[PDB]
Design a protein around this ligand. Structure first.
Ligand SMILES: COC1=C(OC)C(=O)C(C/C=C(/C)CC/C=C(/C)CC/C=C(/C)CC/C=C(\C)CC/C=C(\C)CC/C=C(\C)CC/C=C(/C)CC/C=C(/C)CC/C=C(/C)CCC=C(C)C)=C(C)C1=O
Ligand SMILES: NC(=O)C1=CN([C@@H]2O[C@H](COP(=O)(O)OP(=O)(O)OC[C@H]3O[C@@H](n4cnc5c(N)ncnc54)[C@H](OP(=O)(O)O)[C@@H]3O)[C@@H](O)[C@H]2O)C=CC1
Ligand SMILES: [Zn+2]
Lengths: 96, 342, 460, 115, 125, 208, 86
C-alpha cells in the first residue's frame, strides 16, 4: 500500500515522510530512499475470516513450534471477529 | 526557524549547529579549513566536487556520521548548482584558480561561475551567501585575475544583494602558495625580485583567521550585506618578508633584481606547462603589487577575531623547508622582520 | 500529588503516583495521570514578534528581549503590570516581582481572586487549608461551602471519603447538590444559610457546637464571586462561634481554604495581589502575561497600543493577543517550587529539557533584567531560592506543613467591613464529570482529555 | 589527633618544598620539551602553562593531597622526559581545537540550558 | 608516627573530573520510591545518589537520542544517608537530601467487612 | 538435590576452617576475621599494616608454602569509609590449596608494596594505581600501565562514568589527534533490571 | 523614602522571637487598621533569627534583626520604619 507525498517522496508504512521544507531530504539526492513495498497491514487485511464451530479457538500462527506462542481466543461476541494478538488472523462462529 | 534546524547540543561533533552549508571550492586550500570548522560544531556540509573522489577523502573525517555529503557538479551546468544548493540555508563560494586552463579562464572561474552560483542560490531560496573576492580587486588592475575578481563581485552583488563579500589579502598557511612559493624559489640559486622587492608592501593573513571569520560572518546577523577585508596585523616590505621567510627556513638568501620585462618572460615561459605551473605572468604581477589599504571596510576584529601575526605561525609552514641540521630550531630564534605599519 | 515521570530517550512516557502518606497516598487523579500528552501539542518553541502587518513571526531571543527591554525602559509605575497564571512556579514569580519592583510597579496580580479586606494576605493561615489533608482523618465533622471537592481537589475528596468510611465522619454541604461519592447532608445553596448558622438559629449550628474536632472548608471557587468577602466573613464568624462556644481543644484548626490553583499559594506568600482588580482600576501600558490563560483581561480591557508580553509553554488564549512571545518551560521541564493548598512547599525535577528555544522562566526574566539595565542579583537556581528565602522563608522548607495559627487577628480584622451577600445560589464551576477534564492550557491541548470529554458527553 | 598516616610529608612545609622541587624540574625541562617535540610554541608559553597548571591547585590545604599531586606531576614529567608522550599529548594541555565557552549569564542563556 | 591533620576531606583535585562537572552539578540523595505497578518493596531498601538531568536532543541521522553530559547514567548506592552525604561532600558536589518515606502501619480487620452498624461493611466479595 | 545442584565437600571445608584458625592463632596482631565460603574458599581479613608480615608468612612458613601470587586486584565500595578493598589470591603448590587475603584503604592512605614478597605484584600494583588511585609505598616504579599517556582520573572507580569525560579525533587544522569533551550520537541507555521481589531469603539483612 | 511593603519573619517557637510573637498577638491588629493599604507580610523563619524587612520604591529594601526584642522594641522599630526615621 505505498503512497507518494506532495514532494514526490514515497511514504513508508510508518507514515514517515520528510516535509517540503525539511533540509534532510538532501540525503536522498543522487541516491534513493529505501522503502519496503509489502505493507503488512494491507496483507493481513486480505486474509479471510475463518468460520469455526466453537466458542474458543486456538491459534499458534501455523507451523507448530515455528509460529508464535499458542493463545486461545474467545468468540462469544457476534458484533466482531476474534483477532490473534500475534498473527492478526481472524476467527468467528457462523452467524446469519 | 524550521524546528529541525534549531541548535542543540554543546556545540561539538554530535551537536546540531543549525547551519546547512553548500561549500563550492571545498577541495582546495581554504575549503578544507572551512569544512573542518563547519563540521566541528555539527553543521550539515554539502561538498560539490568535480575532481576525482580520491581527492576528497581528507574531508570525510571532518564531520560526524551523516553530516558531510558529497555530490558531483559542473561549473558550466546550472542544474548541478540547483541540485547542490536546493536544501541549504548557507552557500559559500571558494572556487578559484591562480592560472588559466584550456577549459576555464579567469572570467569563467571568477565572473561566470560566481554569478551562476549567486543567481541559482537566490532562485532556490538560500538565505545567506558568502562570496570570496580579493583585497586588491580592481577594474584597472594590471592583473586580469583581479579585474575578473572585481567584475565578479559586482555581478554577485547584482544577483544576490544580501551577499556577504570577504576580501582577504594573501592567505598564508600549511598548504599556501605564498610562504611555500617564496620558499620554493631557492631551487634556482638566487631570489629574483623586481626592484629588489623594495617597492612592495604586503599584509598577509593567517588561514585559520580567514576560516573563523567566514564562520563568524555566517553567525553574525549584521554581516548580511556587508563587505569585509581580511588582512593581517602587520605590513612588510617584500624584501624584508622574503628575507624573513628564508631566515625561518634557514636557507641562504641571495636576492637579485630582475626587470619587469624579463620576469614577465620567465613567467610566460613557466606558463607553458600542461600541469600546475610553477609561476605565471599573473602571479608575477600579483606578487610585486602592494596590498591596498581600505580603512572604511570592516575587518576581522569587527567579527570578534584578533588577527594572528605571521611571526607566531611562520614556523608551522616553513619547518618543512629546512634541512635536517635545522629541523629542531625553535620559533623565537629568528628575530622577526621589520614592519612598515603606517 | 507526588508523582513519577517516566521518560525514555528524552521523551515523557507516562505519569505514575508516588507514595506520600500525608498528601495523596498512592493515588492520583485522571487529569494528573493522562493529561501529559498535552505537553506534546500546541507548544511554544521560539520567540515571536509582531510583523509590520501584525502577524506573529519567529525571531531570536536577542531581538525579542531587546524590544521588551525598550518598552520596559519607556514606562514606569502603574503603567507596568503583570498577571500570573495557574501553572507558575515560585522562582519565576519572585523574579518577575523583583523586576517590576525595579520599575516601581506593584501591580503583581494573579487570576484567582482572594478577599483583600481585613488581614488579606498578611496572615498566611488566612488563605490556607490549616487542618491539612491528613487532619481530615482526625475530624469528627466537616462543613463544605460553595465547593465541589470531587473535581476541584480529587485527592482531598478521596481523603474525605476515607474518613467518612472509617471514622464515620459527618459531612454537610452548602451549595449546589453535587455527587461526592458519599452521602452528605445538603443544607441548600443559598449563602444566607451561613449567617443562619452563625447566629445559632440552625440545627447544624448545634451539631457544630458539640463536635469535638469540627472542620469548615471554604472553596476558593466560591471566592471568585464579587461578594466573596462577605462569604469569607460569614465563614470566619462560624469558625469564631465554634472557637468560643465549644471551648479550646488545644491545637486544632477549624478555618480552612481549599485551593484549586497550583500557583496561588506561592503567589500569595510572595505578596502578589489576588485577582486583577488593580489592573482594572489603573490599566497599564505594558502588561506581562506569565502563563495567564484564563481570559480575565482582554485587549478590550486595555488602552489601545498596549504592549502585551506572553511567557509560557502553550499557545492558548493568552499567546495570540501578545506582541511578543517568550517560550518558557513546562512543569516537567524544570526544577521549580510549588506550594499546595496546605501551605506545604515542594519542588519538581527536570525530566526532559524544554523543546526548541524555550528556556527556564526565571532565567528568561533575569536575562530580560540584564538587557533592561536593572540586573537582578541572582545568577543560579540556588541564588533565586535564597531570594525566595529572603521574601518568604517557608518556601525553602520542602516538606514542612507546620505554621502559626493567627485566626483571632484575621477574624477581628474581617469584622471591620460589612459587605453584603448576594441572592445568588452557590454554583461551583465544575458541575459534572465533563467539566473536570479541561481546566488549564495543558489539559485543553490533551487529546486524551478530548476523548474523555467525548466519551462522557455521549455514551455509545 | 585524627590519627592519619602520612604519604611523604608530615606538615605543609615539607609538602611545599616538594612542590618547589617539582616546579624546578618542570621549569628546567620545558626548553628541552620544546626542542625535542618540535613544538610551535615558545618556551615562555610552555612555562606559563606549567605555572598555570600548578596554580590550578593552589587552594589545596591537605599535605597528603599535596603529596599525591606531586606524585602525579612527577609521573607526568617522567612521561614527558622519556618521550613516552607524543606531540598530541603535550599539546592537549592547550585545547587548541575547543571553541571558547562563554561565562557570562546572557551568552549561556542564548546558547542553551546548561547553568 | 602520625601527622594529625585537622581539615575536612577534599579529593576533587585528584579525581580528574572537569571543573564544570564539579561546581555546576546537583546530586540528589534519596531512597527511590516504590514502582506503583508492583507491590514488591525490595527496591526501596538502599540510598541512591543521582545527578541532575541535562539536555538530550535528536541525532540528525537515525533520530537517535544524543547527550553531552558524561554523568547522565551515574547512580551510586549507599547503605545509609550519612554515607552518601559524606561521599558527596568529599567529591565537592552540591547535594539535596530527601528523607526516607516509610508507609505508616495500618489497622486491618477482616471482620470489619461485615459490620453490624458501621460503613465498613462491604456490598460484594 | 541431585543432578541440578552442585555437590558439597565437607572434607575440604573442615581442612580450610582448621587452617584459617591456625593462621589466626599465629598472627593475632593483624588478622581481623577468617571466613570459609560454602564452595570451599578461605578468606583472611587483615589490618593494612599486616600486608607484608602476613604475605611473607604465607609464602615462607613450612606449613603454608603459598609460593604463587595468582592475582592482586582492588574493589571499590563507595559506601564504606575505607573505599577500596585490596585482594590477594595465593596458590600453594606444595599443599594444592588456595587462599585469599583481604585488606582495605581509602583515597589518601598508602598501602605497602609487596614486590619484596612477590615480584609478580609489581604490575598488579601498577594496575591498581592506574584503575583505582591507590598509592603503594616503596614501589620500585609506580606509574600508569593501562591508560593513555596523560589520562586523568581512575576509570574503575564506581563514580567514574562509563564513557569517561574526553574522546579523541583527528583534526586537520592542527594536523594531529586531539582530545575534546565527549559527545555521543546515541546515549547509552540505562536499564533498571532489579526485580522488586527478594530473591534469596538466606541473605536478608535486618531492617534497621 | 516611599515605603512599599513590610515583612516580619518570626520563628514559631524559638525563644528569640518571643517578643515578636507577643507583638503579633497584641499590637498587630491596631497596626493593620492604622495602615490598611500597607502590606505587612507575617512569615515564619527557621531558627536563624527574627527579622524585619522594609521594601521601598524602585526595589530598594532594608533588613533589621529583632532577635531577643520585646514587644516594646518591635513597636518602636515599626514606628521608626513607618515614619521618616533612618
Ligand atoms: C608551490 O609549491 C611549489 C612546488 O610544489 C612542490 C614545486 O614543485 C615548485 C617547482 C620547484 C622544484 C620542483 C624544482 C626542483 C628542481 C630545480 C628546478 C632544479 C633546476 C636546475 C637543475 C637543472 C640543476 C642543475 C642547474 C642547471 C644545470 C639547470 C615550485 C616552484 C613551487 O612553488
Ligand atoms: N589563497 C589566497 O591567498 C587568496 C585566496 N582567495 C580566494 O579564496 C578562494 C580559495 O582560495 P584557495 O582555496 O587558496 O584556492 P584553491 O585553488 O586552493 O581551491 C580552489 C577550489 O576551486 C575549485 N575550482 C577551481 N576552478 C574550478 C572550476 N573551473 N570548476 C570547478 N571548481 C573549480 C577547485 O576545485 P579542484 O580541487 O577540483 O580544482 C578547488 O576546490 C579562491 O576563490 C581565491 O581566489 C582570495 C584572496 C587570496
Ligand atoms: Zn495467530
Amino acid at each position: 500500500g505505498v503512497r507518494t507525498s506532495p514532494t514526490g517522496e514515497k511514504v513508508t508504512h510508518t507514515g514517515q515522510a520528510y516535509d517540503d521544507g525539511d533540509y534532510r531530504r538532501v540525503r536522498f539526492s543522487d541516491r534513493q530512499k529505501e522503502v519496503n513495498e509489502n505493507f503488512a497491514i494491507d496483507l493481513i487485511a486480505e486474509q479471510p475470516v475463518s468460520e469455526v464451530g466453537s466458542r474458543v479457538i486456538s491459534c499458534d500462527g501455523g507451523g507448530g513450534a515455528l509460529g508464535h506462542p499458542r493463545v486461545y481466543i474467545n468468540l462469544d461476541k457476534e458484533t466482531k471477529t476474534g483477532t490473534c494478538g500475534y498473527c492478526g488472523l481472524q476467527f468467528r462462529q457462523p452467524h446469519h | 526557524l524550521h524546528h529541525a534546524l534549531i541548535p542543540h547540543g554543546k556545540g561539538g561533533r554530535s551537536s546540531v549547529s543549525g547551519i546547512v552549508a553548500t561549500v563550492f571550492g571545498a577541495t582546495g586550500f581554504l575549503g578544507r579549513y572551512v569544512v573542518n570548522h563547519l563540521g566541528r560544531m555539527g553543521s550539515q556540509v554539502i561538498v560539490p566536487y568535480r575532481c576525482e573522489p580520491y581527492d576528497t577523502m581528507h574531508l570525510r573525517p571532518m564531520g560526524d556520521l551523516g553530516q558531510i555529503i558529497f555530490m558531483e557538479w559542473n561549473g558550466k551546468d546550472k542544474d548541478s548548482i540547483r541540485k547542490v544548493v536546493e536544501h541549504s540555508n548557507v552557500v559559500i563560494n571558494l572556487v578559484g584558480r591562480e592560472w588559466e586552463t584550456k577549459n576555464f579562464d579567469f572570467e569563467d572561474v571568477f565572473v561566470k561561475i560566481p554569478h551562476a552560483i549567486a543567481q541559482v542560490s537566490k532562485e532556490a531560496g538560500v538565505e545567506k551567501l558568502i562570496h570570496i573576492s580579493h583585497l586588491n580587486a580592481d577594474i584597472k588592475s594590471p592583473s586580469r585575475y583581479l579585474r575578473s575578481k572585481a567584475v565578479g563581485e559586482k555581478e554577485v552583488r547584482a544577483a544576490f544583494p544580501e551577499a556577504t563579500i570577504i576580501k582577504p589579502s594573501d592567505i598564508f598557511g600549511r598548504e599556501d602558495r605564498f610562504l611555500n612559493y617564496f620558499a620554493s624559489m631557492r631551487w634556482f640559486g638566487g631570489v629574483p625580485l623586481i626592484s629588489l622587492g623594495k617597492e612592495t608592501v604586503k599584509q598577509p593573513v593567517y588561514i585559520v583567521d580567514v576560516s573563523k571569520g567566514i564562520i563568524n560572518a555566517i553567525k553574525d546577523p549584521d554581516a548580511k550585506g556587508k563587505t569585509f577585508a581580511f588582512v593581517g596585523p602587520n605590513r612588510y616590505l617584500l624584501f624584508d618578508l622574503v628575507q624573513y621567510i628564508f631566515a625561518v627556513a634557514y636557507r641562504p638568501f641571495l636576492p637579485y633584481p630582475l626587470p619587469h620585462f624579463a620576469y614577465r618572460w620567465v613567467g610566460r615561459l613557466f606558463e607553458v606547462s600542461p600541469f600546475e605551473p610553477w609561476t605565471t605572468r599573473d602571479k608575477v604581477e600579483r606578487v610585486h603589487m602592494s596590498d591596498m589599504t581600505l580603512p572604511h571596510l570592516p575587518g576581522l576584529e569587527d567579527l570578534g577575531i584578533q588577527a594572528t601575526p605571521l611571526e607566531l605561525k611562520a614556523i608551522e609552514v616553513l619547518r618543512r623547508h629546512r634541512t635536517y641540521r635545522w629541523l629542531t630550531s625553535e620559533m623565537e630564534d629568528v628575530k622577526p622582520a621589520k614592519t612598515v605599519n603606517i | 500529588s507526588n508523582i513519577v515521570v517516566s521518560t525514555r530517550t528524552g521523551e515523557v512516557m507516562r505519569i505514575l503516583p508516588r507514595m506520600h502518606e500525608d498528601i495523596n497516598e498512592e493515588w492520583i487523579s485522571d487529569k494528573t495521570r493522562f493529561a501529559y500528552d498535552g505537553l506534546k501539542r500546541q507548544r511554544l518553541t521560539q520567540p515571536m514578534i509582531r510583523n509590520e502587518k501584525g502577524l506573529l513571526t519567529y525571531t531570536t531571543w536577542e531581538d525579542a528581549l531587546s524590544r521588551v527591554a525598550g518598552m520596559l525602559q519607556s514606562f514606569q509605575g502603574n503603567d507596568v503590570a503583570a498577571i500570573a497564571g495557574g501553572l507558575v512556579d515560585a522562582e519565576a514569580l519572585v523574579a518577575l516581582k523583583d523586576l517590576l519592583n525595579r520599575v516601581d510597579s506593584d501591580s503583581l496580580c494573579t487570576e484567582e481572586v482572594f478577599p483583600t479586606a481585613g488581614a488579606g494576605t498578611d496572615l498566611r493561615s488566612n488563605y490556607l487549608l490549616n487542618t491539612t489533608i491528613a487532619g481530615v482523618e482526625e475530624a469528627d465533622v466537616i462543613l463544605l461551602v460553595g465547593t465541589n471537592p470531587r473535581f476541584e481537589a480529587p485527592l482531598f475528596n478521596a481523603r474525605i471519603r476515607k474518613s467518612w468510611l472509617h471514622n464515620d465522619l459527618k459531612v454537610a454541604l452548602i451549595g449546589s447538590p453535587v455527587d461526592l461519592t458519599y452521602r452528605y447532608d445538603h443544607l441548600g445553596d443559598s449563602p444566607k444559610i451561613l449567617q443562619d448558622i452563625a447566629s445559632g438559629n440552625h440545627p447544624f449550628s448545634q451539631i457544630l457546637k458539640e463536635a469535638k474536632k469540627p472542620m469548615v472548608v471554604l472553596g476558593s471557587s466560591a471566592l471568585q464571586r464579587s461578594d466573596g468577602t462577605a462569604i469569607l466573613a460569614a465563614v470566619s464568624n462560624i469558625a469564631q462561634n465554634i472557637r468560643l462556644s465549644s471551648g479550646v481543644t488545644g491545637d486544632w484548626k477549624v478555618m480552612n481554604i481549599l485551593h484549586r490553583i497550583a500557583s496561588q499559594v506561592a503567589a500569595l506568600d510572595l505578596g502578589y495581589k489576588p485577582g486583577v482588580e488593580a489592573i482594572r482600576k489603573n490599566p497599564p501600558k505594558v502588561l506581562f502575561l506569565l502563563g495567564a490563560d484564563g481570559g480575565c483581561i482582554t485587549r478590550q480591557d486595555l488602552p489601545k497600543d498596549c504592549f502585551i508580553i506572553y511567557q509560557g509553554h502553550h499557545g492558548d488564549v493568552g499567546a495570540p493577543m501578545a506582541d511578543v512571545i517568550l517560550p518558557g518551560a513546562a512543569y516537567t521541564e524544570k526544577s521549580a517550587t510549588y506550594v499546595n493548598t496546605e501551605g506545604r512547599a515542594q519542588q519538581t525535577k527536570v525530566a526532559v529539557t524544554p523543546p526548541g528555544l524555550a528556556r527556564e522562566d526565571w532565567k528568561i526574566i533575569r536575562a530580560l533584567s540584564e538587557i533592561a539595565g536593572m540586573t537582578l542579583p541572582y545568577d543560579t537556581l540556588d541564588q533565586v531560592r535564597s531570594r525566595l528565602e529572603e521574601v518568604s522563608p517557608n518556601l525553602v522548607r520542602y516538606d514542612d506543613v507546620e505554621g502559626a495559627n493567627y485566626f483571632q487577628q484575621a477574624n477581628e480584622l474581617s469584622k471591620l467591613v460589612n459587605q453584603q451577600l448576594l441572592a445568588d445560589p452557590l454554583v461551583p464551576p465544575q458541575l459534572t464529570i465533563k467539566d473536570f477534564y479541561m481546566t488549564d492550557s495543558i489539559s485543553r491541548a490533551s487529546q486524551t482529555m478530548a476523548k474523555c470529554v467525548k466519551a462522557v458527553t455521549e455514551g455509545i | 589527633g585524627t590519627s592519619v598516616k602520612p604519604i611523604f610529608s608530615r606538615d605543609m612545609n615539607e609538602a611545599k618544598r616538594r612542590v618547589r622541587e617539582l616546579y624546578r624540574a618542570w621549569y628546567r625541562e620545558v626548553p628541552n620539551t620544546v626542542h625535542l617535540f618540535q613544538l610551535d610554541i615558545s618556551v615562555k608559553q610552555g612555562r606559563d602553562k606549567v605555572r598555570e597548571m600548578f596554580m590550578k591547585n593552589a587552594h589545596v590545604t591537605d599535605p597528603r593531597v599535596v603529596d599525591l599531586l606531586v606524585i602525579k606531576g612527577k609521573m607526568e614529567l617522567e612521561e614527558t622526559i622519556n618521550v613516552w608522550k607524543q606531540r598530541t599529548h603535550i599539546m592537549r594541555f592547550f585545547h587548541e581545537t575547543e571553541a571558547p565557552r562563554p561565562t557570562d549569564f546572557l551568552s549561556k542563556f542564548y546558547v542553551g540550558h546548561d547553568p | 608516627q602520625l601527622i594529625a591533620v585537622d581539615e575536612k576531606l577534599d579529593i576533587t583535585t585528584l579525581t580528574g573530573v572537569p571543573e564544570e562537572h564539579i561546581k555546576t552539578r546537583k546530586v540528589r540523595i534519596f531512597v527511590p520510591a516504590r514502582n506503583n505497578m508492583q507491590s514488591g518493596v525490595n527496591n526501596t531498601k538502599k540510598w541512591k545518589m543521582e545527578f541532575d538531568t541535562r539536555e538530550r536532543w535528536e541525532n540528525p541521522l537515525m533520530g537517535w537520542s544524543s547527550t553531552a553530559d558524561p554523568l547522565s547514567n551515574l547512580v551510586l548506592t549507599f547503605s545509609t544517608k550519612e554515607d552518601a552525604v559524606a561521599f558527596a561532600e568529599k567529591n565537592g558536589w552540591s547535594f539535596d537530601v530527601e528523607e526516607r518515606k516509610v508507609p505508616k502501619p495500618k489497622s486491618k480487620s477482616y471482620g470489619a467487612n461485615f459490620s453490624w452498624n458501621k460503613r465498613t461493611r462491604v456490598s460484594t466479595k | 538435590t541431585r543432578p541440578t545442584i552442585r555437590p558439597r565437600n565437607d572434607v575440604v571445608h573442615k581442612q580450610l576452617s582448621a587452617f584459617g584458625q591456625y593462621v589466626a592463632e599465629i598472627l593475632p596482631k593483624y588478622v581481623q576475621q577468617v571466613q570459609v565460603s560454602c564452595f570451599n574458599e578461605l578468606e583472611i581479613f587483615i589490618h593494612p599494616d599486616g600486608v607484608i608480615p602476613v604475605l611473607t608468612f604465607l609464602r615462607d612458613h613450612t606449613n603454608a608454602q603459598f609460593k604463587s601470587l595468582a592475582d592482586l586486584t582492588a574493589v571499590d565500595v563507595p559506601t564504606r569509609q575505607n573505599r577500596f578493598e585490596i585482594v590477594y589470591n595465593l596458590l600453594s603448590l606444595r599443599f594444592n590449596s588456595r587462599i585469599r587475603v583481604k585488606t582495605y584503604t581509602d583515597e589518601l592512605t598508602p598501602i605497602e608494596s609487596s614486590v619484596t614478597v612477590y615480584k609478580a605484584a609489581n604490575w598488579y600494583e601498577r594496575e591498581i594505581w592506574d584503575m583505582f588511585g591507590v598509592f603503594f609505598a616503596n614501589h620500585p616504579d609506580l606509574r600508569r600501565i593501562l591508560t593513555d599517556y596523560g589520562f586523568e582520573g581512575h576509570p574503575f572507580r564506581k563514580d567514574f562514568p562509563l564513557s569517561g569525560y574526553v574522546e579523541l579525533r583527528y583534526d586537520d587544522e592542527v594536523k594531529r589527534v586531539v582530545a575534546e569533551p565527549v559527545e555521543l550520537a546515541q546515549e547509552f541507555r540505562k536499564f533498571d533490571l532489579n526485580s522488586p521481589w527478594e530473591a534469596f531469603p538466606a541473605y536478608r539483612q535486618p531492617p534497621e | 523614602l516611599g515605603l512599599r511593603e513590610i515583612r516580619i519573619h518570626l520563628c514559631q517557637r524559638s525563644p528569640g522571637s518571643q517578643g515578636v510573637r507577643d507583638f503579633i498577638e497584641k499590637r498587630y491588629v491596631e497596626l493593620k487598621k492604622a495602615n490598611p493599604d500597607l502590606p505587612i507580610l507575617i512569615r515564619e523563619c527557621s531558627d536563624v533569627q527574627p527579622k524585619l524587612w522594609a521594601r521601598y520604591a524602585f526595589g530598594q529594601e532594608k533588613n533589621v534583626s529583632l532577635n531577643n526584642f520585646s514587644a516594646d522594641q518591635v513597636t518602636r522599630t515599626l514606628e521608626n520604619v513607618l515614619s521618616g526615621k533612618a
